[PDB]
Amino acid sequence: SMTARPLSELVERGWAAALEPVADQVAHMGQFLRAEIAAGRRYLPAGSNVLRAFTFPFDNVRVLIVGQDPYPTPGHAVGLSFSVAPDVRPWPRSLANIFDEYTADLGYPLPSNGDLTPWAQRGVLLLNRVLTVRPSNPASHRGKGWEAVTECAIRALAARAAPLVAILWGRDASTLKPMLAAGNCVAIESPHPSPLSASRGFFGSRPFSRANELLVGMGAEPIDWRLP
Ligand SMILES: Nc1c[nH]c(=O)[nH]c1=O
Ligand SMILES: [Cl-]
Ligand SMILES: [Cl-]
């Protein structure tokens, strides 16, 4: 529980230190979620998954993907942005669009399922700007305190003596751009892959190959984006 236990128990070591400035804020978010349930509203993803992106090593992140907030359908969000469990089908629409662009950009076949854990395991941080949502209500937790947490995560990543490429999908993600200003960091910004915005510049954006060109140009290894 985010209300009950400290960062050193909840997230990976590097992340617990990176997020020290927002320790109280994370506990505050646990209190917010408690109050939601007391009031008769639910949240997604499950409590134990809310901070899941921060359970993969901070020091290993090479690419940052940021979306808006978790999927609003119960059974979709798993705490890694855009990912779904391997048994989920049909895929959410934004994921179908991501995968369409993945095939167009990289030439790989469509993935077998919507599980993005391989990316997380290979140094891609799958973040959302806001880490919870009320079921069926996109953006319902905007402005409730998560933004300070994800801002802190981005500043910390950018302050590392390491290369970073950021992929910011949509307007809420885009508000992290000012924090991504140091010379060790590069940002790719595009419209979000949701059907509402994807035709404004998501399709054709080639984020995966661009990220790899950027990594190689900073002397970093590219991401193996291939999903099974
Ligand atoms: N639209 C979205 C769906 N699911 C995500 O995890 N992030 C988003 O921005
Ligand atoms: Cl609800
Ligand atoms: Cl209500």
Side-chain angles (χ1 to χ4, degrees):
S1 163
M2 289 176 284
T3 3
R5 293 305 183 103
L7 285 167
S8 60
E9 176 174 346
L10 299 169
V11 302
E12 174 275 333
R13 181 272 319 151
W15 281 114
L19 296 173
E20 187 178 42
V22 291
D24 289 339
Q25 184 72 357
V26 168
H28 179 263
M29 296 316 297
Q31 297 159 9
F32 167 71
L33 297 174
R34 175 183 291 152
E36 290 295 294
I37 297 288
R41 293 180 297 274
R42 292 201 172 233
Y43 68 89
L44 301 165
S48 62
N49 284 330
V50 170
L51 302 176
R52 184 176 178 198
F54 306 132
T55 69
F56 296 83
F58 173 79
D59 288 343
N60 293 8
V61 173
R62 301 203 304 290
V63 177
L64 167 70
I65 293 177
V66 189
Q68 177 178 279
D69 71 328
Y71 290 116
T73 305
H76 284 176
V78 302
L80 295 175
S81 65
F82 301 100
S83 196
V84 295
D87 62 351
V88 168
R89 69 274 198 180
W91 303 335
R93 294 178 186 88
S94 53
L95 188 60
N97 284 350
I98 290 162
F99 287 168
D100 184 293
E101 184 62 24
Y102 161 98
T103 66
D105 182 19
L106 301 166
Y108 296 152
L110 273 175
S112 298
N113 67 38
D115 182 3
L116 306 179
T117 55
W119 293 353
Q121 289 164 354
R122 296 172 186 162
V124 184
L125 180 67
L126 297 172
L127 201 57
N128 280 313
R129 190 74 169 93
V130 166
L131 299 180
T132 55
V133 65
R134 184 187 180 205
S136 310
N137 286 92
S140 49
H141 295 179
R142 189 186 288 131
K144 298 289 187 175
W146 282 120
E147 287 88 343
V149 177
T150 62
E151 177 186 331
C152 183
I154 267 58
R155 293 196 196 274
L157 282 169
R160 300 174 310 156
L164 182 65
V165 175
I167 298 165
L168 306 177
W169 282 337
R171 295 183 73 269
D172 295 355
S174 84
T175 67
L176 295 164
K177 177 68 177 292
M179 304 94 195
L180 293 156
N184 55 320
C185 308
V186 182
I188 294 162
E189 292 181 281
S190 84
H192 189 282
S194 154
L196 292 181
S197 50
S199 300
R200 302 173 191 173
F202 179 75
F203 299 127
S205 63
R206 302 195 74 181
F208 308 107
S209 63
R210 287 163 65 198
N212 282 351
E213 161 73 22
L214 291 167
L215 285 168
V216 169
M218 284 188 274
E221 293 301 317
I223 303 299
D224 182 358
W225 293 106
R226 178 63 141 88
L227 295 164

